[model samples]
Target chain A: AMTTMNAIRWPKKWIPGETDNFVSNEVIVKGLDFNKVVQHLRDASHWEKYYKNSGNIHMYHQDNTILKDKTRFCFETFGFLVEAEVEEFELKDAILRLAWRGWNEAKGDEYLEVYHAWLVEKLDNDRVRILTQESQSGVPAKALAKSVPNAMLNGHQAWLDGLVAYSR
Target chain B: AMTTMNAIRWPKKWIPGETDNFVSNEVIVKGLDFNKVVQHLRDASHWEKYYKNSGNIHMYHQDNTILKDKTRFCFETFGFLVEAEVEEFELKDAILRLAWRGWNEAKGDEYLEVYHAWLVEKLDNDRVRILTQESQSGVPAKALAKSVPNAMLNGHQAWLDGLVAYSR
Candidate 1:
């Protein structure tokens, strides 16, 4: 059985002059053959390198399919709704927005909803754009949060981790 | 909700040649509506007396037409299955047999099956009949056995007293 995948991304810039704090953008990528992508993702060697680097790799059954034919895919782009003014920095000032999009579409909907809600409550961003691809190499927002707690904690990391792990 | 019911007749002569032996028998009485019987049996006061007298009583639920309309209806027949020939003037054999049946039925399906098999093996009488009028009851056979030991110790007087009290 084929499964889904997800990816994570952070904003490129963090500035004090931002008006909005967070936003979540979603897209349904069409014309992509899911079977092929599922096959590649299932290959242990293909994901081993990323698994070793991030220690955030897992597979799940794709029971929930967005498209009837399994060719179309979906992604979630979540941004913080609150407004926070901060000085700009290479990696510090730019608003960090986490987009948990994956090849694992089964957990996509619920995970994204929660992520969007969490981002809006926790972070501040002027504007956010979510872009999804047919590829299976995007990072999971949850993984990034695990790797860096200061960026995601604030008393909700444990709850988020439990949700993510349980969904998987 | 209507409950299922069945008629059970305790034969006057269960243990041949034994005086004061309460022989248990069951007959599918004609024209006796199962619902009425079950309603009567379920009457808290009636069951309290029945259980007290038998030291334990089990009611089964019929799955057929008798109880098909009544989801709460249940029925069961109590009787003694014994081994070893007994002469007149002894109630111990009958009591033991009744205790065995009660214990077996109350413990669970496995114990009940064991007792049934034992009865078949020892009695080998065509007259011994296992009667049922409903699906089954959930009461444990072990509970019945526990009650029996105490009843036996008290010479069934306490048990009879409880029955009288329940009846009143």
Candidate 2:
């Protein structure tokens, strides 16, 4: 009776816990429908429907809102607009993986970069493991990490909880 | 088609927009039932069900969770644990009001204080107006005001939106 370690793919420079700011959120729940979960994350247009913190989404190039390999999009979160590009998108039996890198440039030489990744794997005994990890660098990340109430952790947890609650 | 000015009872010391940090959020919607809206705010126990950012609620005195005049409670928000007490509570024809003063005492003499108030009034044409405003003073308040993404404004807006969405 043990929980397995996460299998998220991480970039060398943005490894979790080593970046300026890092957060990892996971949940193991029974009766989760992967198809609904995948649909929730893949489509940017419906993010606001389930997740209240995300909105004002726009996907560049074509009319597709489903995030795919190399898909470029932007969305507002944590009061900043993130311009992101999907770096990896793979779905298969027992496992689904998605990763994206985002950046923001602000006035007066301020910049922020983040590597966000997710892994959803079917587990034994009628269980599913959903994990999301993020690593961030620059002024915003440092300030967020230092702030009270751990914004990144709480926000990501909200996203995960909303995903599970809505899917069910 | 003109909206009436807000009639929220504000304390002389913590007038909105005059403190170190201030935020005002309002929403006007048709067909909003005041009973549902009042129920949503009065019961602190269910705040987490509709509002994602609020939790760990505990009210002191006589096993009652409904916030009333002079009721004392504590909750976590913005990375700080606030010890709050209701200063004003009134409900009547065409208008309902609630207000609370909260404070946090951090390490090394650091302190934060805030006055938060809410007003719900029946408007013309089956419309209802909901208004919430907050004013803060102390070190944490100053830092929060300077942070990008405007934490107070966005967080309060989310609370308001969640309240409306859940009520309807």
Candidate 3:
């Protein structure tokens, strides 16, 4: 018998004409090797395969109706520096900067809207770190800024969960 | 009877405890021959004679009060490129940068406070050209940013007034 697995999901609603069709984009991991995780993010096939099986895809498609809308999302990861000998325990050794951009379905040729940069660092061998530097533009409320940090943090954890489950 | 005579007077409300008692240290001049002006400014006789006759001794006294208060003011002169190209301009061949420092009763130790850096540049030549660059901190209100351009347009008239009174 197959064992059941769980993952965190971000749900977004779109307002027609006024809002862009992109619901959300998140990081998904299914392995333990850090290098493999980096490689998977660089390959489109990895994203396609994961979305094809994830139940969350149904909701994303429903809200993002019109698959050919030219609206798309992307994820990026950047390495950051961390220093030792600092009195503050919260500082990380290195961090990941994550950003995303999306186009609107209704406004053809409209500029791509960008989210804020997120700082993600490893806390230890088993845990990770995260912070947001600037406020997000193009969005209407402070909630969006809060959402990115939370999602990235949980998303990293979800990736770890997937790796552990698949490895066993 | 001397055809040319110097008169001295003091301000009516001079208070000994609060009034300044030092020589004027700040001098704003057109970008013209700043080196010559520097030489004149450095001459003790010029300051002493001016204070003795103008009874502007009060002005010097005020400067002294400011020094005691630990307040100081400095001077800076900027020359705009466009102004340098004007015909018959005093500062036509002068250096674009010059500045100085001294004490003042009214303004205290803040040399650049009474006059902005750009204002000093404008005083050198009214036609000096300048452009506004977007500041990273934040966009200032319209009222505050309006001074530079307006001064550029009106500055020549003030310079002409000074020329008529001092040199003509």
Candidate 4:
């Protein structure tokens, strides 16, 4: 907790589609769901494992592994504290789909809102196309959209790369 | 969370000496020492039991039994969602001391900052004198100081009475 930063005054909710400050990044990585990929992402610990650049990850509830409805979780990255809660979670037909809505644990009026999603589809041939994306809003996110256009794209692809490599 | 309240600013750090919106109340209730009192407050489920007027209490951590450092918990009351974390917890010679800081899950520009403390001291004969007090700095708290001087006193004493009754 940054004791000196100002709490964001105007916080907004980010749903699935609205655009004003919404931005998303997607990647299609190749892998098998059963391998380290599905278990890696499904398990919260692997988040920091795959993204070493990110700082701390706090599973709000002691063990964040059981991703039930409305599970609150948070992670710190990109010089920002992101607060989030579990939304959609399902594992079916050798596929894994999960999602969450997050926002800057924005201290100091520097806030951002986001919706992150994932879909790892494992094909019959044991190959997978993992698409993990995020939609964002707020001052911090708007800064990303303006200054560095492909910031999230590059960042997410790196995570995909790390997950695939660690799985092997 | 109330969607319309303004988020309070400078909502932190208040010790026992300050009077800038700080307020307190205590009651001498007969009860068991560390057994029922600390047990009731530490567990979180009994929060509503003590303060039955509050709508619901959600132990931020799955089970709030772990009354250690920085343990987070939240409750709702007066049409406002209250967020808090345990800052101090200790027990010695039948005296249980606890302290925590809290704020309105206030939003926008409206905010409230509060620090609450509890001193449950057990006598030689096993009778308990639970002194629960609180300090505040915010428009909402100021409202209490200006007119509702006995606001917290009445509220806390009610909980003390409830605790004495429910301890069995």
- DockQ (Cα-based) per candidate? 0.01, 0.03, 0.00, 0.01
Clashing pairs in 2: A148-B79, A149-B79
In candidate 2 chain B, what residue range of length 10 has the lowest lDDT sum?
B104-113
lDDT by residue (A1-168, candidate 4, tens digit) is 654511111223444355334434444444444645778877777777776545566777655565545788887654345788978777776667777878755454356667777777665465666777677766445444432224466567667777777775
Q: Model 2 segments beyond 4 Å from truth?
A: A1-3, A107-109, B1-168
Q: Candidate 2's error at A40, in angstroms?
A: 0.8
Q: How far is candidate 3 from the true structure (C-alpha RMSD, Å)?
A: 26.3
True contacts kept of each: 0.00, 0.00, 0.00, 0.00
The C-alpha lDDT values of all candidates are 0.25, 0.81, 0.25, 0.62
- The better candidate by lDDT, 1 or 2, is 2
lDDT of 4 at B32: 59
Model 1 is docked with a DockQ of: 0.01
Query: What level of docking quality does candidate 4 show?
Result: incorrect
Clashes of 4: 12
Identify the candidate with maximal lDDT.
Answer: 2
Please give, for residues B61-159, the per-residue lDDT of candidate 4 as tens digits. 665444666888776653246788887777776777787788876554357777777777766565777777787876555445533224456556667
lDDT winner between candidates 2 and 4: 2
On DockQ, the candidate that comes out on top is 2
- Model 3, A21-64: lDDT tens digits are 11212222112344344334323245334422222211132343
Model 1 chain B poorest 10 in a row by lDDT? B114-123
lDDT of 3 by residue, B1-168 (tens): 211111111122221112221111111222334333333333323333322211111223333321122122222122211101101111223322222122232232322111111111222232221111111011222232234223221232222222222321
